[PDB]
Amino acid sequence: ALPPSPPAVNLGTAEDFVILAKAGVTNVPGGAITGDIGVSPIAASAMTGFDLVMDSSNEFSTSTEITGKAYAPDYMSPTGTKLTTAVSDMLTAYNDAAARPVTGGPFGNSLSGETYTNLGAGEIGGLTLTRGVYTYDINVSITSGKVTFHGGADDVFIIKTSKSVLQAANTEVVLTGGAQAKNIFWSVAQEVNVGAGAHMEGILLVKTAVKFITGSSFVGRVLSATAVTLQSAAITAPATSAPT
């Protein structure tokens, strides 16, 4: 029997971005970004490796590797306001996610001897996670294989850690049951590192850095209070296979 689904974490206008980073985005060509990116309060020059061309409006820039638009505070109004509102909404979302109570009681069978606190001693590779709030004071690791999020279309999954999320190379986040990437929230006080060729899903609400190593892929949003590093990575917003 499941716990109730937690409420989804409101991202407000931060949902308008696939990457929002306060201290920059660095890219090694030729991954592919589907969605819009933004930086604030750092200047545009902290988006490197996208060969950005200003639009004639001077409100945004475009790239060969971004399907959408890039936004920075030194661009024309209303871009700076758009960015500042999104960064504030990111902070609110980070704080809300971090404030969610852990789901109570045993995880899996009532005599599993394990709970939603420090589940797997931080290793979640090979686990099936159902809806709820999982809390960690240790790194969360995906060392080998897959982690599965299983639930319905509106079920919510929140993974909180005071440390980092370390996803080894060539591992996968898998969704089953109707579970959607927009309803998975990773609340991370340190960093998120996604190894080479690995596949991550969900909303990354990260206090510090996020790194996507060579050839990794992602469905979700990267919402970082510091900097984002992309190494020939596929970064896709949720639901962009529908008409846009």
Longest dimension (CA), the chain: 64
Cβ–Cβ < 8 Å for 136, 159 = yes
The C-alpha atoms of residue 216 and residue 203 are separated, in whole angstroms, by 16
Q: The tokens 């606190």 sit on which residue? A: 117
Mind spelling out the 3-state secondary structure of 185-208? EEEECCCEEECCCCEEEEEEEECC
The single-letter code of the amino acid at 98 is A
96, two tokens: 């809300």
Which of 90, 114, 98, 220 lies closest to 161, judged by CA?
A: 98
What are the C-alpha distances in Å from 233 to residues 19, 214, 236? 13, 6, 10
Domain count across the chain: 1
94, two tokens: 């980070």
Cβ–Cβ < 8 Å for 70, 47 = yes
The C-alpha atoms of residue 56 and residue 16 are separated, in whole angstroms, by 22
Mind spelling out the 3-state secondary structure of the chain? CCCCCCCCCCCHHHHHCCEEECCCEEEECCCEEECCEEECCCCHHHEECCCCEECCCCCCEECCCECCCEECCCCCCCHHHHHHHHHHHHHHHHHHHHCCCCCCCECCCCCCCCECECHHHHECCCCEECCEEEEECCCEEECCCEEEEECCCCCCEEEEECCCEEECCCCEEEEECCCCHHHEEEEECCCEEECCCCEEEEEEEECCCEEECCCCEEEEEEEECCCEEEECCEEECCCCCCCC
Q: What angle do CA 33, 35, 39 make, to 5 degrees?
A: 90
Q: Which residues neighbour 40 within 8 Å (Cβ) at sequence distance 6 or greater?
A: 20, 22, 71, 72, 73, 80, 83, 84, 86, 87
Q: The tokens 């996968």 sit on which residue? A: 172
The single-letter code of the amino acid at 66 is I
Cβ–Cβ < 8 Å for 42, 22 = yes
Cβ–Cβ < 8 Å for 197, 21 = no
136, two tokens: 């960690």
Give the chain's length. 244
The C-alpha atoms of residue 135 and residue 38 are separated, in whole angstroms, by 29
The C-alpha atoms of residue 190 and residue 210 are separated, in whole angstroms, by 9
The C-alpha atoms of residue 164 and residue 178 are separated, in whole angstroms, by 27
Strands 25-28 and 228-231: parallel
Burial (CB count within 10 angstroms: exposed 0-12, middle 13-18, buried 19+), residue 50: buried
Structure determined via? X-ray
Cβ–Cβ < 8 Å for 179, 149 = yes
Domain residues for the domain of 221 are 1-244
Cβ–Cβ < 8 Å for 2, 179 = no
Burial (CB count within 10 angstroms: exposed 0-12, middle 13-18, buried 19+), residue 28: middle
